[PDB]
């Protein structure tokens, strides 16, 4: 019967709720007292990357912490040098509705997908000079929300038809397919060892997946609305979120429940992308009221504000060495906040 | 300028990339980006056949004006999470089939098909993004609308109608049930047109109504309005 299975599933929901309550002996906010607070961190705009002409919807730092791809809502995908703010490439995309962007961690490839449901993969370091499309990864139904390279041949593209996927670039077919979400998937983040990834969604639930196994390890819940930001802790054992009830939550993969919450009562707006710092002490979350504000990650004190943008900060990225923070907004500028 | 011979020639690449974005940000500013919304079973395919995956950009020129229409009906995803991509369109072309006033949708409980295209109309007028973007509204299939209003009245879809089973007494009733769904009578205009087989004068309506939007958007950009 369909009725007795819903009679059973809530008991398993009542068993996971009891098991997480058997482990919540001490809150993180009371363990993370009796330590030094981080104090106010002020970060000034060091660069402004100007050349876009529409809403920057995504960016991704290249793994050398100097290059920077940035997909915006014209047909362009500009690869910025950051240290002397030149444009290394400008890649005219085939559909100008791109909701995501990814720099491959070898430097060679760059992917961007969007409302065309297709994850085009570009080959920068080539022989004939110009940046060339190597693949167009079809096969999703809804819009693409986030693309992430594991290496130069696997890419994890979470789309909006309630499904993530794992691709093989050299062939062009989905190897696995991570389903189990209700409602859209809005952002993913690979673990720093690239074995697991989480995937925030529009049913207020992140979900820890395994790229080798093929289905969900554990499903986190606790938000009130659409989760549209995910960042792993740099340890790779916890992860933040960000949602449209204007609150972050630091979850944990080993305790299977959220550890703290990041809400100020003077913000009501919603979150577009979060990102930890190096060492996992800051939780720089990008909000709809045009400002990032650096939460301390252990105590919920809002330890600064990166207001320099004239519209919604819709993409946020900390370098792989932690030397700078690049945010990009719905006005076409992309300020780098060292 | 303490730049090397290659650091100088890298900036010359950045300046000749900038000169190709600004030269392609003027081929993109000359074009008019519409947005063909509408519910299912309306006749959006009647209109993109009258002119010329997920999104499908349709290009067509009229009187040296290059248009672009984005039919997002093939998305089948949540409309909330990508409708801010079209925040700066010129004019939301809407489509309402007049002929679905007596048809129903089998999925939801009551689900008059006209009652949901009215509810999508209220959901895109009153978006926080579509404050300025003036809706062009195409009431499709008025020729099929006469050949079933002489049989069946509009009192099915709307109890609050007091009139006879005639076209003009009721086709203008639907327009005044649509033009008042916006809570912004001051910020945007709703242009309405009754397309059946009017295939010459539908792009002419869009060229006139976009030129009305282009003029009023200029006169606020100058401050004069």
């Amino acid at each position: 019967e369909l009725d007795q299975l819903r009679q059973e599933a809530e008991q398993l929901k009542n068993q996971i709720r009891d098991a997480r309550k058997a482990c919540a002996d001490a809150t993180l906010s009371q363990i993370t007292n009796n330590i030094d607070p981080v104090g106010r961190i002020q970060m000034r705009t060091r660069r402004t990357l100007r050349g876009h002409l529409a809403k920057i919807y995504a960016m991704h730092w290249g793994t050398d912490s100097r290059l920077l791809v940035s997909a915006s809502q014209d047909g362009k995908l500009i690869i910025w040098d950051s240290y002397t703010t030149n444009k290394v490439h400008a890649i005219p995309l085939r559909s100008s509705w791109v909701m995501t962007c990814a720099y491959a961690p070898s430097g060679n490839y760059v992917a961007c997908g969007g409302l065309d449901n297709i994850c085009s993969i570009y080959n920068l370091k080539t022989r004939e000079g110009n940046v060339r499309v190597s693949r167009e990864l079809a096969g999703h139904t809804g819009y693409l929300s986030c693309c992430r390279f594991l290496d130069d041949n696997q890419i994890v593209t979470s789309s909006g038809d309630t499904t993530c996927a794992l691709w093989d670039i050299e062939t062009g077919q989905q190897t696995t397919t991570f389903t189990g979400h209700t409602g859209d998937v809005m952002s993913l983040s690979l673990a720093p060892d690239t074995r697991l990834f989480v995937s925030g969604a529009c049913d207020a639930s992140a979900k820890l997946w395994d790229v080798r196994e093929g289905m969900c390890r554990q499903t986190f819940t606790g938000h009130e609305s659409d989760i549209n930001a995910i960042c792993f802790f740099p340890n790779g054992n916890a992860f933040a979120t960000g949602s449209d009830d204007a609150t972050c939550r630091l979850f944990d993969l080993r305790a299977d429940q959220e550890l703290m919450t990041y809400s100020h009562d003077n913000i009501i707006c919603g979150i577009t992308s979060v990102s930890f710092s190096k060492s996992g002490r800051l939780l720089l979350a990008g909000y709809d009221d045009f400002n990032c504000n650096v939460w301390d990650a252990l105590k919920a004190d809002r330890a600064g504000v990166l207001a320099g943008h004239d519209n919604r900060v819709s993409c946020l990225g900390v370098t792989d060495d932690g030397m700078a923070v690049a945010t990009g907004s719905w006005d076409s500028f992309l300020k780098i906040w060292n | 300028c303490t730049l090397s011979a290659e650091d100088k020639a890298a900036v010359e690449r950045s300046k000749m990339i900038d000169r190709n974005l600004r030269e392609d940000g003027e081929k993109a500013a000359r074009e008019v980006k519409l947005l063909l919304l509408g519910a299912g079973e309306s006749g959006k395919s009647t209109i993109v056949k009258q002119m010329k995956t997920g999104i499908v950009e349709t290009h067509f020129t009229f009187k040296d004006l290059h248009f672009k229409m984005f039919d997002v009906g093939g998305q089948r995803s949540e409309r909330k999470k990508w409708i801010h991509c079209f925040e700066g369109v010129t004019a939301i072309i809407f489509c309402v089939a007049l002929s679905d006033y007596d048809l129903v949708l089998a999925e939801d409980e009551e689900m008059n098909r006209m009652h949901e295209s009215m509810k999508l109309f209220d959901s895109i007028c009153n978006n926080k993004w579509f404050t300025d973007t003036s809706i062009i509204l195409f009431l499709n299939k008025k020729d099929l609308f006469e050949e079933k209003i002489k049989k069946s009245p509009l009192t099915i879809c709307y109890p609050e109608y007091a009139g006879s089973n005639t076209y003009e007494e009721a086709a203008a009733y639907i327009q005044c049930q649509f033009e008042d769904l916006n809570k912004r009578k001051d910020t945007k205009e709703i242009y309405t047109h009754f397309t059946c087989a009017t295939d010459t004068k539908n792009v002419q309506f869009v060229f006139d109504a976009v030129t009305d939007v282009i003029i009023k958007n200029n006169l606020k950009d100058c401050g004069l309005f």
């Epitope: 240290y83 004939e128 000079g129 | 303490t2 090397s4 011979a5 290659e6 010359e12 000749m16």
Partner: single-chain antibody, 231 residues
Framework: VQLVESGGGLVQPGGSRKLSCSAS????????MHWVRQAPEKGLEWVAY????????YYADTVKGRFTISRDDPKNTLFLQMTSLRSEDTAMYYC??????????????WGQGTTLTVSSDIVMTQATSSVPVTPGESVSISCRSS???????????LYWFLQRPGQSPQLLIY???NLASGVPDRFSGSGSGTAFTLTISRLSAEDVGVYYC?????????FGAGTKLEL
């Protein structure tokens, strides 16, 4: 990807000739192109330069004012009109391509090179003779500038070229330590400042040829006289 060259012949001194190279196989309009000549018993020597979009043209001081480098980017050809040529302008005139962005490899492709016979500044000091060597041997080929090549941005602009004889030189080490695409990994460059070494750890007989170093800090743009290798 090739860069074939036209022109060539035997003009009288005071005469003129127009070299042209037809570049095909790459997006030519975004490549800074060069002209590099090689006197027939001697090493390489730099002649002219045109940038992407022809927006910046340099010349060497020996051929400044007489030579005019130009190109037609829709035609995918690069010219060099030489006027009032001397008897020291007899050389094989290679064409080079070089794209400059962050992390690019300039001078990566060299043309065939047409001989143009005529009828009769950083200095790079290699100074090493035709070294006889057995394969499998670690060879250190050392160049030495007259300036600290390490720029303020941390890049050391030294390039290492292998001209196998009968061919055009090809890039090996496209900055201080880097390696061109296609060079086997046994080649390695080392050093900083003024003293640089190209160390081929494993050897063969296929990488025999003469080895030029080149600086790239500023557009004098001189080559070293090549350390010849032989078996």
């Amino acid at each position: 990807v090739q860069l074939v060259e036209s022109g060539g012949g035997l003009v009288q001194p005071g005469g003129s000739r127009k070299l042209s190279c037809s570049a095909s196989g790459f997006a030519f309009s975004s490549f800074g192109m060069h002209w590099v000549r090689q006197a027939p018993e001697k090493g390489l020597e730099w002649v002219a330069y045109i940038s992407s979009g022809s927006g910046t043209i340099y010349y060497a001081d020996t051929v400044k004012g007489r030579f005019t480098i130009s190109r037609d980017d829709p035609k995918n050809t690069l010219f060099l009109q030489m006027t009032s040529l001397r008897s020291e302008d007899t050389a094989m005139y290679y064409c080079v391509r070089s794209i400059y962005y962050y992390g690019s490899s300039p001078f990566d492709f060299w043309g065939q090179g047409t001989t143009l016979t005529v009828s009769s500044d950083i200095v790079m000091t290699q100074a090493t003779s035709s070294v006889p060597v057995t394969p499998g041997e670690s060879v250190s080929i050392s160049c030495r500038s007259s300036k600290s090549l390490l720029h303020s941005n941390g890049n050391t602009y030294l390039y290492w070229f292998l001209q196998r004889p009968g061919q055009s030189p090809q890039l090996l080490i496209y900055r201080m330590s880097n390696l061109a695409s296609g060079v086997p990994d046994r080649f390695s460059g080392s050093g900083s400042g003024t003293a640089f070494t190209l160390t081929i750890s494993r050897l063969s007989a296929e990488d025999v040829g003469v080895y030029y170093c080149m600086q790239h800090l500023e557009y004098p743009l001189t080559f070293g006289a090549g350390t010849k290798l032989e078996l």
